[PDB]
Design an enzyme around this catalytic site. Structure first.
Site, PDB file in Angstrom:
ATOM      1  N   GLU A 111      39.011  50.952  40.620  1.00 15.78           N
ATOM      2  CA  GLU A 111      40.005  50.287  41.237  1.00 15.78           C
ATOM      3  C   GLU A 111      40.508  50.546  42.637  1.00 15.78           C
ATOM      4  O   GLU A 111      41.399  49.493  42.991  1.00 15.78           O
ATOM      5  CB  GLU A 111      41.388  50.735  39.876  1.00 15.78           C
ATOM      6  CG  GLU A 111      40.930  50.191  38.515  1.00 15.78           C
ATOM      7  CD  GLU A 111      41.632  50.786  37.575  1.00 15.78           C
ATOM      8  OE1 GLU A 111      42.763  51.538  37.775  1.00 15.78           O
ATOM      9  OE2 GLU A 111      41.348  50.518  36.306  1.00 15.78           O
ATOM     10  N   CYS A 131      45.755  48.641  35.504  1.00 17.68           N
ATOM     11  CA  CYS A 131      45.381  49.628  34.598  1.00 17.68           C
ATOM     12  C   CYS A 131      46.687  50.729  34.324  1.00 17.68           C
ATOM     13  O   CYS A 131      47.833  50.091  34.144  1.00 17.68           O
ATOM     14  CB  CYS A 131      44.267  50.609  34.943  1.00 17.68           C
ATOM     15  SG  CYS A 131      43.509  51.511  33.667  1.00 17.68           S
ATOM     16  N   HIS A 154      46.411  48.078  31.303  1.00 16.69           N
ATOM     17  CA  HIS A 154      45.452  48.632  30.002  1.00 16.69           C
ATOM     18  C   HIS A 154      45.963  48.761  28.939  1.00 16.69           C
ATOM     19  O   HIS A 154      46.899  49.018  28.609  1.00 16.69           O
ATOM     20  CB  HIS A 154      44.576  49.982  30.489  1.00 16.69           C
ATOM     21  CG  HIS A 154      43.379  50.075  29.981  1.00 16.69           C
ATOM     22  ND1 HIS A 154      43.326  50.954  28.845  1.00 16.69           N
ATOM     23  CD2 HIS A 154      42.239  49.936  30.292  1.00 16.69           C
ATOM     24  CE1 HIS A 154      41.982  51.097  28.641  1.00 16.69           C
ATOM     25  NE2 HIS A 154      41.438  50.391  29.556  1.00 16.69           N
TER      26      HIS A 154
END
Lengths: 191, 191
Positions: A16, A111, A130
């Protein structure tokens, strides 16, 4: 010329971090990694054990107002432990609150990084993150959308490592010319 | 215990390194980063300027036969400069030639890292890589497939930063149980 801050902490997810980093570098848009942590050398232990240097410490920046004169995009990556630290740091919350709804600023969270929307008291209606933080976000009154990338106002949210490229692209889409975006996109060999 | 080597050099692409790294870490499959370069402290300057420590220098490994005693999977990521270095390092070519068509060994190459197939003289018929190396791969006699990932024998090749997650997954798929593979896959939020 737009400048980007990619926040990073011990425990930040490598994938990420790397997607928006590599995308903005290809776009020739300035981007700095800004570490939230105590190591005095700005050496970061990432979520899955990569050891890498950040460009700056957040302690170099006195306030969210000063941050805003330095950067136009603030990115909060995930990884379980990194997201916890970033989302609970008052400075990061202040930056997020300051940037929200500004016409020349953009925020990205991916996330577990999306927990920062909740901790910063953002009032957007719709969001993604997420699946492991879905419950937490719906408690905060967010409507969770099961899709790779969500935009509301100037807050881009995204799900996980598999969507980090789409997330980086959505951020780039906000600031790149059409030709710059298309060239960068085409260079990536998106599937 | 499958053991992975992710080769890295100055100029290695951040995205293509981080995807297989994070995927194998999630799978709890041992993985080392193995640096090929001049820096005596294993500090690597990546393609887009991340500075990261590798776990090992390749100089710690006395021969390709010794490498085969230690690792089962060899991964060569792209980035222009990193792939130039890795593809032209006899140790890397020797590992690739030794591993090719061997039971329970695997080789992955992505983007410009795919030039290592040509420099090593791999006799696979089909291949993919970055559109930027498409002609050069073709010149070595390969049939280029325009798709994210190509598996032939025990060689996995892939196109670019956008395909790095599909690439890491295709590697994992060869060595993990269906159960482990499905769990790791699910955790990534693939689009």
């Amino acid at each position: 010329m737009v400048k980007v801050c990619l926040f990073v902490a011990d425990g930040t997810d490598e994938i990420e971090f790397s997607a928006p980093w590599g995308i903005f570098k290809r776009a020739e848009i300035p981007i700095d990694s800004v570490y939230v942590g105590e190591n005095k050398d700005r050496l970061v232990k990432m979520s899955r054990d990569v050891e890498m240097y950040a460009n700056r410490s957040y302690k170099e920046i006195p306030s969210a107002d000063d941050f805003a004169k330095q950067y136009d995009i603030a990115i909060i990556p995930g990884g379980g432990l990194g997201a916890k630290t970033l989302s609970t740091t008052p400075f990061v919350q202040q930056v997020v609150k300051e940037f929200y709804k500004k016409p020349n600023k953009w925020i990205g969270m991916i996330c577990a990084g999306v927990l920062t929307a909740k901790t910063s008291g953002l009032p957007n209606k719709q969001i993604t993150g997420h699946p492991s933080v879905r419950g937490q976000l719906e408690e905060g009154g967010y409507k969770y959308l099961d899709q790779p990338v969500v935009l509301e106002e100037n807050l881009i949210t995204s799900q996980g490592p598999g969507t980090a490229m789409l997330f980086g692209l959505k951020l780039l889409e906000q600031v790149a010319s059409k030709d710059k975006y298309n060239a960068v996109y085409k260079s990536l060999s998106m599937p």
